[PDB]
């Protein structure tokens, strides 16, 4: 039979219809009055969080982060540039907003490590994502068969090096064949042409 | 009044001093910032790749 | 070229800032719950550095000492009232709705409770014309008919210090002293007198703006100089 979770999932396929639509209209009013990174005791999208590795356990944290919508907030050149390098308006950054969200969340909790994150909507001027963070120092996690892997030293500050699921996607690592000639094993090893 | 010798006599202000963190006489006592190691500006130590030839 | 003076202003460096640390207070109306049960006694008359006009120090019943934007005719000892039921007399503050049509008012609020925005300069005054349950009509000093919420508070009488502008400065030194009390860079070097690099009008053998002065509203800063979006110029016609 269908899991209760499937229902949360199905509601979020069309956040603009049904009860969910009404919920968002209500919630966002409060979110707009909240800070940049708000820790929350429970994921707004349980199914999604559990699917990404979330667990109701000690050392598991969830935080919502909001980021301004739009392209790059860039300053026009103050020195000589050929027409090609004078652009300012239509230039966009290479990291998607979800990634910027994961990094701000991780800065807020220096001791925690980003596990994954997912979207929870947006209005006209900002986007919200919830980020799952894990405490690599808590024994309840050090003893977890599904999460202890994130306790290894080489996982420290994983988000800042693009090791996140959103990080790997944004780096063009999804495809294993055609089109990934310059993304794998890293953007840098491939001269930064990916 | 020339910008040269005559203007040099007006110089009796103490700015750069012995830095507590690095020991160089680069701690600007007015700005409270060391121009050599960055003390007062950053926890990290002031450093730049242009301080040496590019391939070295 | 280089940024023009108008652009240096925006950065708000000392050269362009007002001597705020020397200013006294912001003559905003008092806030009363309701009833008008607020009256104070004019304890003194002072000079307001930011406006070159006099200000009245008042001591209210509830024990609050605050400077007020004084109209002409207020003196020490006098008693002032602030509230809906305030008596209709010079120096008193109350919502337009309570003021009788045809009465000169000053320090008029733009939005009920903001403290006063209009007609605060020397010897000026707004003229309350039409009354209503939805809109109070006031003729501002510029001659413009302004539509305000009848709830906007105001003070009866014209602002003190009228006629200040009738006497010429006569000398640069006098202008100097006044300018030193404002957020203004003075004296003024003409654009035509500068180098091309410094202003749209700079350059050329003899001084002259090698271009029409009437500039478009859409012009970017650095270029918007001279006669901004003029509907006309000169005295003719």
């Amino acid at each position: 039979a269908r899991s209760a979770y499937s229902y949360i999932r199905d509601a979020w396929e069309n956040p603009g219809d049904g009860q969910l639509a009404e919920l968002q209209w209500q919630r966002q009013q409060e979110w707009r009055n909240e800070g940049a990174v708000e820790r929350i005791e429970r994921p707004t999208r349980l199914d999604k969080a559990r699917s990404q590795g979330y667990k109701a356990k000690q050392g598991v944290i969830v935080a919502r982060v909001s980021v301004r919508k739009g392209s790059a907030r860039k300053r026009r050149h103050k020195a000589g540039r050929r027409s090609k390098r004078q652009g300012v308006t239509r230039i966009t950054r290479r990291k998607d907003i979800q990634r910027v969200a994961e990094e701000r969340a991780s800065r807020t909790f220096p001791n925690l490590r980003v596990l994954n994150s997912y979207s929870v909507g947006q209005d006209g001027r900002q986007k919200w994502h919830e980020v799952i963070l894990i405490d690599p120092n808590h024994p309840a996690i050090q003893n977890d068969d599904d999460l202890s892997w994130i306790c290894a030293d080489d996982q420290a500050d994983r988000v800042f090096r693009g090791l996140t699921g959103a990080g790997r996607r944004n780096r063009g690592l999804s495809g294993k064949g055609k089109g990934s000639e310059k993304t794998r094993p890293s953007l840098r090893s491939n001269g930064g042409k990916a | 009044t020339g910008a040269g010798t005559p203007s040099q006599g007006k110089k009796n202000t103490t700015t750069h001093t012995k830095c507590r963190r690095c020991g160089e006489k680069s701690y600007h006592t007015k700005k409270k910032v060391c121009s050599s190691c960055g003390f007062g500006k950053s926890a990290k130590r002031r450093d730049y790749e242009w301080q040496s030839k590019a391939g070295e | 070229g280089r940024r023009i003076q108008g652009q240096r202003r925006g950065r708000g460096t000392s050269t362009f800032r007002a001597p705020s640390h020397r200013y006294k207070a912001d003559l905003e109306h008092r806030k009363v719950e309701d009833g008008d049960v607020i009256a104070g006694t004019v304890v003194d008359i002072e000079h307001d550095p930011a406006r070159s006009a006099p200000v009245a120090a008042v001591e209210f019943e509830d024990g609050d000492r605050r400077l007020i934007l004084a109209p002409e005719g207020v003196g020490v000892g006098d008693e002032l009232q602030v509230g809906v039921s305030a008596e209709i007399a010079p120096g008193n503050t109350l919502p337009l709705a309570e003021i009788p049509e045809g009465v000169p008012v000053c320090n008029v609020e733009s939005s009920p409770g903001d403290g006063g925005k209009f007609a605060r300069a020397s010897g000026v005054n707004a003229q309350l014309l039409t009354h209503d349950r939805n809109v109070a009509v006031v003729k501002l000093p510029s001659g413009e008919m302004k539509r305000l919420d009848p709830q906007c508070r105001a003070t009866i009488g014209v602002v003190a210090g009228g006629g200040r502008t009738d006497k010429p400065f006569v000398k640069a030194g006098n202008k100097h002293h006044k300018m030193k009390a404002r957020g203004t860079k003075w004296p003024n070097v003409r654009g035509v007198a500068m180098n091309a690099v410094d202003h749209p009008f700079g350059g050329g053998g003899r001084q002259h703006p090698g271009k029409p002065k009437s500039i478009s509203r859409n012009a970017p800063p650095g270029r918007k100089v001279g006669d901004i979006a003029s509907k006309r110029t000169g005295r003719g016609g």
Binding site: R82, S83, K84, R85, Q86, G87, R90, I91 | - | -
Partner: protein, 92 residues
């Protein structure tokens, strides 16, 4: 100059002399789907667009004849070198 609308001449198709009708070549309409069209959209962006920022060249004082010669019996046309002519009017 004057030009007869029809006249006998060699038809490279029938491979023999037959009556032909002369017509000025009318410009065919573009589709906007040629490779060059796609290259312009791909290579134009912020700033100068190289060849795609260039504008139409000039004109020669006189243009060369640009006609179609259609065989009155097989319906097929053939082209020929053109010759400079200030004006070209057909007779009949």
């Amino acid at each position: 100059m004057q030009m007869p609308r029809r006249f006998n001449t060699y038809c490279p198709h029938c491979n023999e002399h037959q009556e032909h009708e002369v017509e000025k070549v009318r410009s065919g309409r573009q589709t906007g789907m040629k490779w060059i069209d796609r290259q312009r959209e791909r290579n134009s962006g912020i700033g100068n667009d190289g060849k795609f920022s260039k504008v139409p060249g000039g004109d020669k004082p006189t243009k060369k004849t640009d006609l179609k010669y259609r065989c009155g019996e097989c319906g097929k046309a053939h082209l020929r070198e053109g010759w400079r002519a200030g004006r070209l009017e057909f007779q009949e």
